[PDB]
Design an enzyme around this catalytic site. Structure first.
Site, PDB file in Angstrom:
ATOM      1  N   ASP A  41      -4.407   1.960   3.715  1.00  0.00           N
ATOM      2  CA  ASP A  41      -3.606   1.274   4.770  1.00  0.00           C
ATOM      3  C   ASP A  41      -4.259   1.387   6.170  1.00  0.00           C
ATOM      4  O   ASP A  41      -3.499   1.246   7.168  1.00  0.00           O
ATOM      5  CB  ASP A  41      -2.169   1.821   4.769  1.00  0.00           C
ATOM      6  CG  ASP A  41      -1.230   1.199   3.732  1.00  0.00           C
ATOM      7  OD1 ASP A  41      -1.323  -0.042   3.440  1.00  0.00           O
ATOM      8  OD2 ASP A  41      -0.406   1.968   3.194  1.00  0.00           O
ATOM      9  N   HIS A  98       3.936   3.225   7.981  1.00  0.00           N
ATOM     10  CA  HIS A  98       2.517   3.045   7.569  1.00  0.00           C
ATOM     11  C   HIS A  98       1.590   3.823   8.507  1.00  0.00           C
ATOM     12  O   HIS A  98       0.671   3.229   9.104  1.00  0.00           O
ATOM     13  CB  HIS A  98       2.159   1.564   7.474  1.00  0.00           C
ATOM     14  CG  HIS A  98       2.790   0.872   6.317  1.00  0.00           C
ATOM     15  ND1 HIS A  98       3.876   0.040   6.448  1.00  0.00           N
ATOM     16  CD2 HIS A  98       2.482   0.890   5.008  1.00  0.00           C
ATOM     17  CE1 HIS A  98       4.218  -0.418   5.262  1.00  0.00           C
ATOM     18  NE2 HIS A  98       3.371   0.083   4.364  1.00  0.00           N
ATOM     19  N   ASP A 146       1.989   4.108  -4.239  1.00  0.00           N
ATOM     20  CA  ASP A 146       2.475   3.303  -3.097  1.00  0.00           C
ATOM     21  C   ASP A 146       3.998   3.034  -3.182  1.00  0.00           C
ATOM     22  O   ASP A 146       4.614   2.918  -2.125  1.00  0.00           O
ATOM     23  CB  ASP A 146       1.666   2.018  -2.979  1.00  0.00           C
ATOM     24  CG  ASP A 146       1.529   1.518  -1.552  1.00  0.00           C
ATOM     25  OD1 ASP A 146       1.541   2.368  -0.623  1.00  0.00           O
ATOM     26  OD2 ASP A 146       1.378   0.298  -1.392  1.00  0.00           O
TER      27      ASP A 146
HETATM   28  C1  LIG Z   1      11.705   4.105   0.335  1.00  0.00           C
HETATM   29  O1  LIG Z   1      12.156   2.789   0.124  1.00  0.00           O
HETATM   30  C2  LIG Z   1      11.236   1.789   0.192  1.00  0.00           C
HETATM   31  C3  LIG Z   1       9.868   1.962   0.050  1.00  0.00           C
HETATM   32  C4  LIG Z   1       9.033   0.863   0.070  1.00  0.00           C
HETATM   33  C5  LIG Z   1       9.551  -0.414   0.216  1.00  0.00           C
HETATM   34  C6  LIG Z   1       8.695  -1.604   0.170  1.00  0.00           C
HETATM   35  N1  LIG Z   1       9.244  -2.716  -0.040  1.00  0.00           N
HETATM   36  N2  LIG Z   1       8.295  -3.643  -0.030  1.00  0.00           N
HETATM   37  C7  LIG Z   1       8.794  -4.994  -0.284  1.00  0.00           C
HETATM   38  C8  LIG Z   1       9.043  -5.856   0.921  1.00  0.00           C
HETATM   39  C9  LIG Z   1       9.917  -7.075   0.667  1.00  0.00           C
HETATM   40  C10 LIG Z   1      10.729  -7.041  -0.604  1.00  0.00           C
HETATM   41  C11 LIG Z   1      10.032  -7.307  -1.919  1.00  0.00           C
HETATM   42  C12 LIG Z   1       9.143  -6.205  -2.458  1.00  0.00           C
HETATM   43  C13 LIG Z   1       8.167  -5.616  -1.464  1.00  0.00           C
HETATM   44  C14 LIG Z   1       7.046  -3.238   0.251  1.00  0.00           C
HETATM   45  O2  LIG Z   1       6.049  -3.906   0.392  1.00  0.00           O
HETATM   46  C15 LIG Z   1       7.183  -1.736   0.335  1.00  0.00           C
HETATM   47  C16 LIG Z   1       6.698  -1.187   1.683  1.00  0.00           C
HETATM   48  C17 LIG Z   1       6.420  -1.093  -0.831  1.00  0.00           C
HETATM   49  C18 LIG Z   1      10.919  -0.576   0.373  1.00  0.00           C
HETATM   50  C19 LIG Z   1      11.756   0.507   0.378  1.00  0.00           C
HETATM   51  O3  LIG Z   1      13.096   0.377   0.578  1.00  0.00           O
HETATM   52  C20 LIG Z   1      13.671  -0.845   0.140  1.00  0.00           C
HETATM   53  C21 LIG Z   1      14.660  -1.320   1.152  1.00  0.00           C
HETATM   54  C22 LIG Z   1      15.432  -2.501   0.630  1.00  0.00           C
HETATM   55  C23 LIG Z   1      14.584  -3.278  -0.319  1.00  0.00           C
HETATM   56  O4  LIG Z   1      15.495  -4.003  -1.111  1.00  0.00           O
HETATM   57  C24 LIG Z   1      15.017  -4.793  -2.106  1.00  0.00           C
HETATM   58  C25 LIG Z   1      16.101  -5.353  -2.736  1.00  0.00           C
HETATM   59  C26 LIG Z   1      15.913  -6.234  -3.775  1.00  0.00           C
HETATM   60  C27 LIG Z   1      14.644  -6.579  -4.180  1.00  0.00           C
HETATM   61  C28 LIG Z   1      14.463  -7.615  -5.198  1.00  0.00           C
HETATM   62  N3  LIG Z   1      15.424  -8.322  -5.765  1.00  0.00           N
HETATM   63  N4  LIG Z   1      14.812  -9.151  -6.638  1.00  0.00           N
HETATM   64  N5  LIG Z   1      13.534  -8.981  -6.616  1.00  0.00           N
HETATM   65  N6  LIG Z   1      13.299  -8.021  -5.708  1.00  0.00           N
HETATM   66  C29 LIG Z   1      13.560  -6.004  -3.539  1.00  0.00           C
HETATM   67  C30 LIG Z   1      13.745  -5.109  -2.508  1.00  0.00           C
HETATM   68 MG   LIG Z   2      -0.660  -1.481   2.170  1.00  0.00          MG
HETATM   69 ZN   LIG Z   3       0.666   2.025   1.300  1.00  0.00          ZN
END
Ligand SMILES: COc1ccc(C2=NN(C3CCCCCC3)C(=O)C2(C)C)cc1OCCCCOc1ccc(-c2nnn[nH]2)cc1
Ligand SMILES: [Mg+2]
Ligand SMILES: [Zn+2]
Length: 333
Positions: A125, A84, A237
């Site tokens: 951000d 970030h 994003d």
């Molecule tokens: C280049 O890569 C990525 C880019 C951004 C992210 C983000 N991630 N987040 C999230 C934080 C917490 C998780 C929730 C979403 C928001 C952001 O705020 C941001 C920062 C957008 C992540 C990147 O790499 C990913 C690594 C493993 C994630 O793995 C998973 C697996 C499974 C599910 C899942 N299963 N069921 N429902 N959701 C989600 C996520």
């Molecule tokens: Mg943000």
């Molecule tokens: Zn952002």
């Protein structure tokens, strides 16, 4: 409140970006950063070229100098964190440019709304410290207590909006100083609404609202415009998985390191550490990208493309080829 100097402006203006096309969907910001020993100046020059090439600042009474002052006031409020940082918000600005002009989403918005979206990318951000909203609330940090007492759980998004209003309160860095009355109000309100909508706790409800407005030929026009802006900033994003596999992987390495540093500090504070924030679980990059693709990014891009944004079909195609490539990393391990 401290004014940008002529010397600060000249350091950006000298960058010529030879061999780069900042308008292209395969543009490589990591290659642009490695091309020079002043990556902060190159990043500021990418943002400046994108905004002038749109032709929008010119139309709304924003001079070249006020634009560059704004870009450099934004740059000073980003921190040296792994993900970030200033490079993320310039990436989001460049990506939104491709969605508007290569994916033809500009056809759905006014010129003012296109100008606000490119500017909002650079504020969205401000002063991120590499810790998410959950960290501040679980640790009862002072910002967490203020958000809870205040009634708004979007801890960081309200903070980003506060610093954006501060930059724009000085005419020398106000890219909206050419506007008055209803146009000036729309620029500030739309910018704020877009930044507030990047809180991932509101992901599902923001997507469902946009899909229901797109399906309804009698939707309020002003409301459809605002939701389209919110969905385009959200798309930028979470756009890392829509890029050339190598660019996608470098973003994934940067976000993983930021998550692991949060987990390290949560251990020291004695609060809950989620598995994907814990270095000790040693979780594989491939399985984490496939999970993010399957549950977050593939359904988001596929739904907005099918509902309304047909010109952005390349995003769905590239998520598909990236998933297949991560599957080959597993198949050969
Ligand atoms: C280049 O890569 C990525 C880019 C951004 C992210 C983000 N991630 N987040 C999230 C934080 C917490 C998780 C929730 C979403 C928001 C952001 O705020 C941001 C920062 C957008 C992540 C990147 O790499 C990913 C690594 C493993 C994630 O793995 C998973 C697996 C499974 C599910 C899942 N299963 N069921 N429902 N959701 C989600 C996520
Ligand atoms: Mg943000
Ligand atoms: Zn952002």
């Amino acid at each position: 409140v401290t004014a940008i100097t002529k010397v600060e402006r000249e350091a950006v203006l000298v960058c010529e970006l030879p061999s780069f096309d900042v308008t292209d969907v395969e543009f490589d910001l990591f290659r642009a950063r490695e091309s020079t020993d002043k990556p902060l100046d190159v990043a500021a020059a990418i943002a400046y070229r994108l905004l002038l090439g749109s032709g929008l600042p010119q139309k709304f009474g924003c001079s070249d100098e006020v634009l560059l002052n704004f870009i450099l006031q934004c740059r000073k409020k980003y921190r040296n964190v792994p993900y970030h940082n200033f490079y993320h918000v310039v990436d989001v600005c460049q990506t939104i440019h491709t969605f508007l002009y290569r994916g033809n989403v500009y056809e759905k918005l006014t010129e003012l709304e296109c100008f606000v979206l490119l500017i909002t990318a650079l504020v969205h951000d401000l002063d991120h410290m590499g810790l998410n909203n959950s960290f501040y609330l679980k640790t009862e940090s002072p910002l967490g207590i203020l958000s809870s007492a205040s009634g708004n759980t979007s801890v960081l998004e309200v903070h980003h909006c506060n610093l954006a209003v501060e930059i724009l309160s000085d005419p020398e860095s106000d890219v909206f100083d050419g506007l008055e009355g209803a146009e000036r109000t729309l620029a500030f309100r739309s910018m704020i609404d877009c930044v507030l909508a990047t809180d991932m706790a509101k992901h599902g409800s923001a997507l469902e609202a946009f899909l229901a407005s797109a399906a309804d030929q009698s939707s309020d026009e002003a409301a459809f415009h605002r939701m389209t802006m919110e969905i385009i900033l959200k798309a930028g994003d979470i756009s890392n998985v829509t890029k050339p596999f190598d660019i996608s992987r470098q973003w994934a390495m940067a976000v993983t390191e930021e998550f692991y540093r949060q987990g390290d500090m949560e251990k020291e504070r004695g609060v809950e550490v989620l598995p994907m924030f814990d270095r000790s679980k040693n979780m594989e990059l491939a399985k984490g990208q496939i999970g993010f693709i399957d549950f977050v990014a593939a359904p988001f891009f596929q739904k907005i493309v099918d509902a309304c944004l047909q010109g952005m079909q390349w995003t769905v195609d590239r998520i598909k080829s990236n998933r297949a490539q991560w599957e080959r990393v597993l198949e050969t391990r």
